[PDB]
């Protein structure tokens, strides 16, 4: 919070300016990202906002995805439904009715009965099955090639800071690139994926059932494996590897060992992704964090 509550005031002003008949009675910051801030307005609406950003056309795609899904999905699981939007280079805002519920965490999962956990898993698999099964023709432009993206990111590294890196850093990168070249995990089914499908985006109702999913801001047509990456993740923020496995078995018709290889490859990539983000957005701290993380990983066992 600020002394002038300046942030909330500016955003109040912008919301009321751009959405002619919209009246802000209350407004608080409910989240923030790398270059975004999310607000809860009138205890009822979520407004996601961003100023000038490296990924332009970002809130436009995300909007198009919400519209495609609200038209085409048949599910009881809620997702954002965009009522207000303002999109420009210098400012983008998306407003939708807040989905009510509690975000899944490791702690909450641990308190659930075995059966509750099973049902949650079933609900997740069933949603992913339905989304991955959609004919995505009407959003065929929202395509993401991860391998190619990584190859282009590697070139950017080589054109920028690569020569200043340590040998240890270089070896980490090259060793990953060799793995990227040898793997077959990009050669499988492509489909519409959420693509940031981690438990901080999953909402539970009062019966610990899946009631909503948020933040399709990275969604697109991509490898089917993508949506299992965080479900398979072993970390403090995610539930655990067995959670993802079970979900994969419920989901069915998918090579689990390849999903894991996909996840493991993306995990290996994370510090490099972090470096790249720092380069592209001119934020040194990200470059430094990624490089340090390479050393932590190098010295792990
Ligand atoms: C903006 N969407 C995601 C971003 O949220 C972030 O994804 C995070 C992702 O970074 C996070 O995992 C990474 O970061 C973990 C921790 C440092 N997160 C703060 C440690 C493990 C590592 N795989 C996941 N547990 C949750 C996931 N939503 O990175 C990729 C991305 C495309 O920028
Ligand atoms: N309860 C609830 N919270 C929401 C909803 N939409 C957004 N939020 C809150 O706002 C936060 C930020 O929303 P989100 O779409 O994830 O923002 P973002 O700009 O894409 N950031 P990031 O991609 O890093 O998660 C969420 O973590 C959550 O706290 C919603 O419908 N319901
Ligand atoms: Cl640095
Ligand atoms: Mg997001």
User: Which are the catalytic amino acids?
Assistant: 196
Evaluate: CB of 31 within 6 angstroms of ligand 2.
yes
Question: How far is residue 276 from each of residues 54, 156, 293, measured CA to CA in Å?
Answer: 12, 8, 13
Instruction: Report domain extents, the chain.
Output: 8-97, 101-301
3 Cα: distance to centroid of ligand 1 (angstroms): 32
Experimentally determined by: X-ray
Return d(Cα 246, Cα 221) in angstroms, integer: 24
Instruction: Specify the CATH number for 101-301; select among 3.10.20.600, 3.40.50.300, 3.40.50.2020, 3.90.1200.10.
Output: 3.90.1200.10
- Other beta carbons within 10 angstroms of residue 185's beta carbon come to 21
45: left (phi over 0), alpha (psi -120 to 50) or beta: beta
Question: How far is residue 209 from each of residues 61, 96, 126, 212, measured CA to CA in Å?
Answer: 29, 22, 13, 9
β-pairing verdict for 220-223 and 190-193: antiparallel
269 Cα: distance to centroid of ligand 4 (angstroms): 19
State the binding site for a gentamycin: 215
- Which neighbouring-strand residues pair with 87? 92
Residue 297 buriedness (CB in 10 A; 0-12 / 13-18 / 19+) = middle
Residue 254 buriedness (CB in 10 A; 0-12 / 13-18 / 19+) = middle
Of 116, 188, 157, 155, residue with least CA distance to 271: 157
Closest ligand to residue 197's CA: 1
Evaluate: CB of 267 within 6 angstroms of ligand 1.
yes
What angle, 0 to 180 degrees and rounded to 10, lies between the N-to-C axes of helices 146-159 and 256-280?
Answer: 30
SS3 call for 79: coil
Enumerate the H helices of the chain as residue ranges: 6-18, 58-72, 106-111, 114-133, 146-159, 167-182, 241-251, 256-280, 284-298
User: 29, 30, 63: which to mutate for ligand 2, most atoms within 8 A of CB?
Assistant: 30
230 Cα: distance to centroid of ligand 4 (angstroms): 14
User: 270, 281, 285, 296: which to mutate for ligand 1, most atoms within 8 A of CB?
Assistant: 270
**Which H, E and C letters describe 108-147, residue by residue?**
HHHHCCHHHHHHHHHHHHHHHHHHHHCCCHHHCCCECCHH
- CATH homologous superfamily for the domain 8-97: Phosphorylase Kinase; domain 1 (3.30.200.20)
Q: Which residues of 2-28 are buried (b: 16+ CB within 10 A; e: fewer)?
A: eeeeebbeebbebbeeebeebebeebe
| CA 272 to the chain's CA centroid | 17
Residue 148 buriedness (CB in 10 A; 0-12 / 13-18 / 19+) = exposed
Evaluate: CB of 48 within 6 angstroms of ligand 2.
yes
Check if the beta carbon of residue 66 is closer than 8 Å to that of residue 79: yes
β-pairing verdict for 91-97 and 45-51: antiparallel
Q: What is the resolution of this structure in A?
A: 2.3
- Other beta carbons within 10 angstroms of residue 285's beta carbon come to 9
């Amino acid at each position: 919070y600020d002394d002038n509550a300046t942030n909330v005031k500016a955003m109040k002003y912008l919301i009321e300016h751009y959405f002619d008949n919209f009246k802000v009675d209350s407004i608080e910051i409910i989240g923030s990202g790398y270059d975004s801030v999310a607000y809860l307005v009138n205890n009822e609406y979520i407004f996601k906002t961003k100023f000038s950003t490296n990924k332009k056309k970002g809130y436009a795609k995300e909007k198009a995805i919400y519209n495609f899904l609200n038209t085409n999905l048949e599910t009881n699981v809620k997702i954002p439904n965009i009522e207000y939007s303002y999109i420009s280079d210098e400012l983008s805002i998306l407003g939708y009715k807040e989905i009510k519920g509690t975000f899944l965490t490791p702690e909450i999962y641990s308190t659930m009965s075995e059966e509750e956990q099973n049902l949650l898993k079933r609900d997740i698999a069933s949603f992913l099955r339905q989304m991955h099964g959609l004919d995505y023709t009407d959003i065929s432009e929202c395509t993401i090639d991860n391998k190619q993206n990584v190859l282009e990111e590697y070139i950017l590294l080589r054109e920028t800071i690569y020569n200043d890196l340590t040998d240890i850093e270089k070896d980490y990168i090259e060793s990953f690139m060799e793995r990227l070249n040898a793997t077959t995990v990009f050669e499988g089914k492509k489909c519409l994926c959420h693509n940031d499908f981690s438990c901080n985006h999953l909402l539970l109702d009062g019966n610990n059932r899946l009631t909503g999913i948020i933040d399709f801001g990275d969604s697109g047509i991509i490898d089917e494996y993508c949506d299992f990456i965080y479900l398979l993740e072993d970390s403090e923020e995610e539930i655990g590897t067995n959670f993802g496995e079970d979900i994969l078995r419920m989901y069915g018709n998918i090579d689990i060992e390849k999903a894991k290889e996909y996840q493991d490859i993306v995990e290996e990539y994370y510090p490099i992704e972090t470096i790249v983000y720092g380069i592209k957005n001119i934020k040194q701290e990200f470059i430094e964090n990624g490089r340090k993380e390479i050393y932590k990983r190098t010295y792990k066992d």
